[PDB]
From a paper:
The direct target of thalidomide and related IMiDs was identified as cereblon (CRBN), which was initially reported as the gene associated with inherited autosomal recessive mental retardation. Among them, SALL4 is a C2H2 ZF-type neosubstrate for CRL4CRBN involved in embryonic limb development with a strong genetic link to embryopathies. To elucidate the SALL4–CRBN interaction mediated by the (S)-enantiomers of 5HT and thalidomide, we determined the high-resolution crystal structures of the ternary complexes (1.80 and 1.90 Å, respectively) by using the thalidomide-binding domain (TBD) of human CRBN (residues 318‒426 in which C366 is mutated to Ser for the crystallization) and human SALL4 ZF2 (residues 410‒432). On the other hand, SALL4 ZF2 shows a typical structure of C2H2 ZF domains consisting of a β-hairpin (β1′ and β2′) and an α-helix (α1′), which are connected through Zn2+ binding with the conserved CXXC and HXXXH motifs (C412, C415, H428, and H432).
Author numbering:
A (entry chain A): 318 to 426
B (entry chain B): 409 to 432
The structure:
C-alpha cells in the first residue's frame, strides 16, 4: 500500500513513505556499524506506528550525536524493527525520530 | 546485563538473550 511494513508480519504497517527524511548528510538511509560490527542500513522517519519501546534511552554508541536511542520492536510479532531516537537537548530539530533497519521492512528498499 | 550484539536489546537472563538473538 502506501506504507512500509514489518517484514515478519508482512502486513503490520510501521511508517509511510511521506515520513522519510534526511537527517544525516549521508542521506535518509545510510549504513551504520554497531559496536559488534553489525551493519544496519537505517532509514530515518519522523513518525512510526505499531512499535513497542524496550528499556531506557541510551546515548552510548549513538549514530546521531545529541540523540539517545531506544530499541523498538513490532508490537504484533516482537521482531526488531529499529530504534527510537530522542533529543537530549531542547533546541534540537527534530526532537525525536525513528531509525528503521532495512532488513526488517517490506517492501525491500 | 546481557545484551544482544545485533540490536542492543538488554536482558536480565542469558536464556532470553539466546532465544532473542537467534530470532534475528
Ligand atoms: O544509534 C545506535 C543505535 C543502537 C546501536 N547499537 C547496537 O545495535 C548495539 C548492540 C549492542 C550494544 O552493546 C550496543 C549497541 C548499540 O548501541 C548503535 O550502535 N547505535
Ligand atoms: Zn511484526
Ligand atoms: Zn537483538
Amino acid at each position: 500500500c502506501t506504507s512500509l511494513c514489518c517484514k515478519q508480519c508482512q502486513e503490520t504497517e510501521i511508517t509511510t513513505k511521506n515520513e522519510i527524511f534526511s537527517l544525516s548528510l549521508c542521506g535518509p538511509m545510510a549504513a551504520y556499524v554497531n559496536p559488534h560490527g553489525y551493519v544496519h542500513e537505517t532509514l530515518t522517519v519522523y513518525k512510526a506506528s505499531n512499535l513497542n519501546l524496550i528499556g531506557r534511552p541510551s546515548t552510548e554508541h549513538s549514530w546521531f550525536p545529541g540523540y539517545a536511542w531506544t530499541v523498538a520492536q513490532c508490537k504484533i510479532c516482537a521482531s526488531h524493527i529499529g530504534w527510537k531516537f530522542t533529543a537530549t537537548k531542547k533546541d534540537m530539530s527534530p526532537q525525536k525520530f525513528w531509525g528503521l533497519t532495512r532488513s526488517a521492512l517490506l517492501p525491500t528498499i | 546485563s546481557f545484551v544482544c550484539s545485533v540490536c542492543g536489546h538488554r536482558f536480565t537472563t542469558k536464556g532470553n538473550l539466546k532465544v532473542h538473538f537467534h530470532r534475528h
